[PDB]
Amino acid sequence: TGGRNSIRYSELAPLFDTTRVYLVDNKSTDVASLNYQNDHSNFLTTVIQNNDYSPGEASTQTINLDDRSHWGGDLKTILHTNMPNVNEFMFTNKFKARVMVSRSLTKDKQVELKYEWVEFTLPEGNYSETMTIDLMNNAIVEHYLKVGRQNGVLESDIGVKFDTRNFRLGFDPVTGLVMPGVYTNEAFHPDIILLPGCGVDFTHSRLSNLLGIRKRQPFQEGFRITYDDLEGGNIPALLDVDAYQASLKDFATRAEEKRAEAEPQKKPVIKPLTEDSKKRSYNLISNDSTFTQYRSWYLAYNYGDPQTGIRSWTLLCTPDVTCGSEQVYWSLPDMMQDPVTFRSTSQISNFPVVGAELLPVHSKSFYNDQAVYSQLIRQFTSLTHVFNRFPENQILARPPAPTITTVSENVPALTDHGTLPLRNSIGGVQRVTITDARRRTCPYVYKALGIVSPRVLSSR
Amino acid sequence: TGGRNSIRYSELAPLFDTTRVYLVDNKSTDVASLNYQNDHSNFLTTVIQNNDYSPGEASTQTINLDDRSHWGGDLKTILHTNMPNVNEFMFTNKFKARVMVSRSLTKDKQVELKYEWVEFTLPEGNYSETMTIDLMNNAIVEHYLKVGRQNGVLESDIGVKFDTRNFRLGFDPVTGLVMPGVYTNEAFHPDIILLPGCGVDFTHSRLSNLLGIRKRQPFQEGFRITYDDLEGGNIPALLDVDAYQASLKDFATRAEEKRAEAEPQKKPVIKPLTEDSKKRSYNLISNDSTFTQYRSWYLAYNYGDPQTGIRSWTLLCTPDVTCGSEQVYWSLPDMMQDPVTFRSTSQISNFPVVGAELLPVHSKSFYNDQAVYSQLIRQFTSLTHVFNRFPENQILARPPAPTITTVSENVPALTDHGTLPLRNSIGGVQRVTITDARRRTCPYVYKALGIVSPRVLSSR
Amino acid sequence: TGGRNSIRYSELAPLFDTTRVYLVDNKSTDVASLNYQNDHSNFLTTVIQNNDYSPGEASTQTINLDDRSHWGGDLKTILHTNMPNVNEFMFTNKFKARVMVSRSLTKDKQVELKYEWVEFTLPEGNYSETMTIDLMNNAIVEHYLKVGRQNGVLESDIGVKFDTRNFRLGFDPVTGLVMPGVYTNEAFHPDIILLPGCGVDFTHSRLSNLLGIRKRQPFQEGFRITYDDLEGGNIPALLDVDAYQASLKDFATRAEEKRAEAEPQKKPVIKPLTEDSKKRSYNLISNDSTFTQYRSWYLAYNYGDPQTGIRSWTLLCTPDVTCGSEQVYWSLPDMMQDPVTFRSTSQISNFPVVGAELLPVHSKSFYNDQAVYSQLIRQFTSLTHVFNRFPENQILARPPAPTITTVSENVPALTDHGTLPLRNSIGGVQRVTITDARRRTCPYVYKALGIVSPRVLSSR
Amino acid sequence: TGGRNSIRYSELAPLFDTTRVYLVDNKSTDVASLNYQNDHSNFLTTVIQNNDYSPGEASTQTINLDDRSHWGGDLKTILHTNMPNVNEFMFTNKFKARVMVSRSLTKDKQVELKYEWVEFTLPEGNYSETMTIDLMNNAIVEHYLKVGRQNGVLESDIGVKFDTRNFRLGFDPVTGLVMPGVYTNEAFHPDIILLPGCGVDFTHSRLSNLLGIRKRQPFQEGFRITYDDLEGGNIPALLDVDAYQASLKDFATRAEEKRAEAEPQKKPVIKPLTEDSKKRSYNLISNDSTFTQYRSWYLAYNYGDPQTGIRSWTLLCTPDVTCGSEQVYWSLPDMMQDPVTFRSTSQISNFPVVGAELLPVHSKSFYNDQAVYSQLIRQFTSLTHVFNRFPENQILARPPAPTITTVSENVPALTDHGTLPLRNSIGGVQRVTITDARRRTCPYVYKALGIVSPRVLSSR
């Protein structure tokens, strides 16, 4: 310490031992003159807080930490964003899926079904865990319109759907059917329902995470999940409720009558429904088999061979609307020594990093009353949303709203990076820069604030 | 340390090493006598906590940190506000918009439409993310009354509306219409709906942030968004439900009948509704085109040319009721050495700063049940609010309440600034001062509290 | 300090005193080349952040903390998971129970009841405190179908049920019956209802904790709870409401008439209901006794002999959906000295541990409105869920939804382990590894992030 | 430092300066062999984390902090419980009350009323702020059955009730009655309603706190609150609505008609109802007085003489379901020097204490919709709960559910005790022990975890 303290500035007098320099954006004189063309994630600040000098002029003067000692400063920072759930940047507004795009009776008498991969995009915005799903299903439909239908494609065969129920709860081990005649619409994790000849790929989208279907060994570029993959676990068919109902015309310890009332002339059972009001085909494999051609991921993962099925190369897990906690990197190139192996440069997308921190986004959870409220309004017929374009379908229906939805929420992060080594000649104008994992500014930054407290560390 | 500790006061005896001085407002003797004309964001305190002296008299005595050493103190502080969502100070109660103000059949046979920019102001108060919007739409209307109407202006042409839905979900790629005959009223981010010849400017309002429409490169003084800007993305027109309904009088794998039931004598389709009950014009460009003159920001941003549209110079992002996390600056001029480049002065609006901190305001989020509850009460006719003065309009209607509203909430902030260098002759009366980004006291401060713990740092 | 600081790298120049090395997974060049076959819970990272070298090549270079001093580093870390409530890994998707599997009239005239232990498994997913229960009851039923029934087993005798009410609130001390004729369906802690000859074992499942039935002295491998254990506390029988109703044909201080209206020809009381609509046996011990054979844990614990009953060897406590706060262990084998007694090795499942921390999972609680809403919909008959397959049973009914449900929620954990001693020759490529209590990678890890700040500790 | 660092272990080599020893329960080898008969609140751990030695054998080896220096360690700990709201341990399942137990027409013509103190106990479980109350009222009733009634006791005179409303809002200053004929059922703090000759004592129960009736000077063993105490503040009687209704047969500034319409032949007023449907006596003092014999604490405290009433020796305050934040004490007898005045021993219930911390329980609050929902279901007659056995009573009714209920919630506590002095010969097997205020293990502990970081403090 002794003679090694002195923190000096032009004529303003000797200041001794730690003090404070401030890195701020909202400084009025600065804006107008320096970072006009820049944004909150990469700006310039005049660190000289002296009322009497031009910003330019200030950019000349310097804060001089005493020369005789190696100095260090404590860097506390306040980061605040407002990035939305889905958007083009975080890759949460795009996702490739393969759908039916044409259906025509080929030249002889056999038929033709051609499929193709199309990229659907969502309208940017901050959504729910669910409404997002919906937005996706809609984006599938919206395409079926501009193309599908007007080429022999019947809704009765739209290839991909993102639903959320266990399509085999009512299932009866012997009848081979979902007895209650209705797939019990309770929500149990996002799922993916495919059809023959198609599938979906998330190779370039974090939406995968929103669904909560993660690859069992991530560092593998590429995420395609097709029909052939979802093996074992095709949605069983609903039993014909009416056919069954309409039919039926042609120890001794109180356990006596209970054992005789519980027990050629066959019944209407066997009849697995085939279509629904407005006759929508449920595409059943055989006029025999109780299983529909529709295949569910959830079903696969949980019910089909664990050592071979998707349960093998994939992993079932929690949703997370945020799509993935990603971090950001601070850099104060003009004011702090470049950490260990970092090379010193001027290429904004490669500056040295002084602090890392998670991008300020959490997921708040709320209890959903609207879960059932809706089961008592479409049972009492009325208009439809662009979401339930197939009310009477039990499959292309509208995935049940899960109780407890999550919502991406932005929050101020009063973080604190360690104490770093800094130069002893701090320039009048410092440059602040926040970067993301991929190394690029981040448009969604409303406020960055830095406070540095230099203090002597050793001697030269 | 050795002889360098001694912290002395008048005759009260030697105290050694760190101790504690207190900066408090609520001190009774002080109020009455010193900071009568001041407020919590800029007051005087007697730091001498000795029961026997006048405040004035105390203002004489002094705490003497030993002379032989440079001292420093730890400054912990308790800040607590209660600033409201919208108000004149934070510039959240004003916003300029350009509306229709006159409509008369000019002198020959052609007509005249004159527009003007008017500043509307809100009643101060703490609001919701939504009700705020509403308050704005109302403030637009309230003006149409004092002027608009009484000058040939028909509601059928009020220029600006802040709604919240995706005005083109039901849209059908071929019919060029919102088929369901009703813009699906679900909430998807605040938006701005304009008309020809008008627009809105936020150049002097943080309300912009409330909406969540941020300028892609902020440091540009000025925020005007007009009709001509919102290009490509005019709200498509609702299809005539009745005209259509009223009309209609004059492979082989179960997929056989599904491919024949899905497939001069033209139909009522083409008819895009023109007005609504009480005949309100939907101002359609041509008696032909399926698009209304009404233009939506949301629509533009998401659907019209990304490299040219507003999607270019603007950015879609999360709301935030608070309107923008702003920070405040502490200053203890009379008790702590003036940080690096700060000049020492007496101009309250330029004191030295010792600590920065975010102004104590966060946004709590809640789940909205009232989302739909209201769709089942205006469907069952009854009175109206100053908010839905055009129930039967599908456009000047009332923006749908988003599920999950946010509310600005004030909270005590037990913050902690570093350890700062201080003078060794602390005056009997210290002056505390909290300032905002622009540098001015902040009326909304209920309590400021400071605790300082001096301790030796080096030697002289 | 003096000559002991120097932190050196290849030619890049001398850095002095603490600096920062970064342990990150999401680093792009790394993924592709090193940890292709690995996962977030056990990967390799290149700690050399120098743009110009191959990852391989970098793996050669080294960060050299000065040799003359023993160094240490501060390890802060960011861990973020997404593990679901129930799953095979945490052992929350399996649980052994003993049920009735066969009922046939043995060879002479006496009968045979054979029971067996079967393991039921749940569909993996993140659930509620309740819906989980339900999933279990269902899994019991689902078995009764594939086997039970089709072998003389009547629902009237399914052995295990997980409900949640105090099966003896309405109980009347004298009549020996649940007077109101209905077990008051309010929720009061998960319970277990057994039958003669069966029970449940959790020896290999944390689901026990979900129920909130903990063993009074845990370190005892094994958790079997059978009928014979639940002694004293058999669910009393519901009084015959109708029999009773249908019958009844054949001081003086205002307290006079109150003392005469409150006061061979016997009444219908004695009649304890025996079965319910669709005549389901309530299996009553004697044609006499007011107690059914059904036995409840809750009942036992709270009402039967505390010094002998289950209240003795077991403990009643709060649920917790997470099933048990378990911790994880960090290990940075290639960069930090192996703590006290740890042996140095290469067996991933035995690396040295540098930091311990709770696996990032908490339980959020919400208020349940859906508590009663359902009591006003099954009272108005309509379809049933795979959950209430015995609506009219008062016992095999559907446990009442408790107000205040809990839900396992994943959250980012910005933790901070101490300051650790490290090697002075940090390899170009470090290995990160998170392990669980049992010592194995943890599939449910989305992001691991490490920041180390070396700084001199002493001298060599 | 110099030669004073060395932290040594058997042959495993010299480790220098701070390192880390771990205190963990879940360690597999340990359980089976050492703490079989113990529980999480008092177990043994092998601190030697070396894979090759028996636990027993390890118990021999030792960690040797260098002898030449006095060492200290940082103790961070992770405590996690799951204790329920009410239970026998925390004394929240018992509470003595004095009730009517016999009513017979004594030998001459005068009568006899004998009362007695009885201890009622609740079924263990985690409850609500309210449902707890209810459970208590029920427990009062449940007794009236096994005894009361069957001895001339009419519900019309059950002595104690815990309700929650201000039994005198409708009250009219002149009529001396609760005009609206109904005690306005809004919730305003737990209360206690007594009758002549009885009362309640909490001398041995924290439930008092749940109610929120605290003794004004706590350190006084004993908490009895009887009738005679609740003086001034007897619940006024409801006015006879019918008698009144059934009767009535036999300046000039617009303020003219308002002053004549607002103004022998007496009216039905005076008639204060006496009993209610099913004629339940309201026990009124005189056939005259408008006050019933029923006395309320709330009423007393707020309305009767503040200098003499209960308002004097008692204190009205917030509920808190937890019943009282109690703390726990850590102790690591075998590894850390015994703090200042603590005597060293082997009596588990007197070990030295190294850290204190609040027992991990907080109270979450939720908004109650179910507040009114119930006022619109018992107004539409139907069955009753064991809770509203006197629907038609306005007093023995069922206390109104307060909006905003609280619920005891268990939470992991990542606490951190200071840095403590420790022995330099740490035994292979350490003993961990958590104790409560009264000094006894705490059954409700699911996980205890300790991390110690020794580091040199001075020299010997």
Swiss-Prot record, chains A, B, C, D:
Gene Ontology MF annotations: structural molecule activity
Keyword field: Capsid protein, Clathrin-mediated endocytosis of virus by host, Host nucleus, Host-virus interaction, Late protein, Phosphoprotein, T=25 icosahedral capsid protein, Viral attachment to host cell, Viral penetration into host cytoplasm, Virion, Virus endocytosis by host, Virus entry into host cell
Keyword Phosphoprotein in record: yes
A Pfam family hit: Adeno_Penton_B
Cysteine pairings via disulfide bonds: none
Induction of expression: Expressed in the late phase of the viral replicative cycle.
Subcellular location: Virion; Host nucleus
Gene3D superfamilies reported for this sequence: adenovirus 2 penton base, domain 2 (3.90.1620.10), Penton protein, domain 1 (2.60.120.550)
Written domain comment of the UniProt record: The cell attachment RGD motif is exposed at the virion surface and is involved in binding to the integrin heterodimer ITGAV-ITGB5.
Stated family: Belongs to the adenoviridae penton family.
Name of this chain's protein: Penton protein
Species: Human adenovirus C serotype 2 (HAdV-2)
Lineage: Viruses, Varidnaviria, Bamfordvirae, Preplasmiviricota, Tectiliviricetes
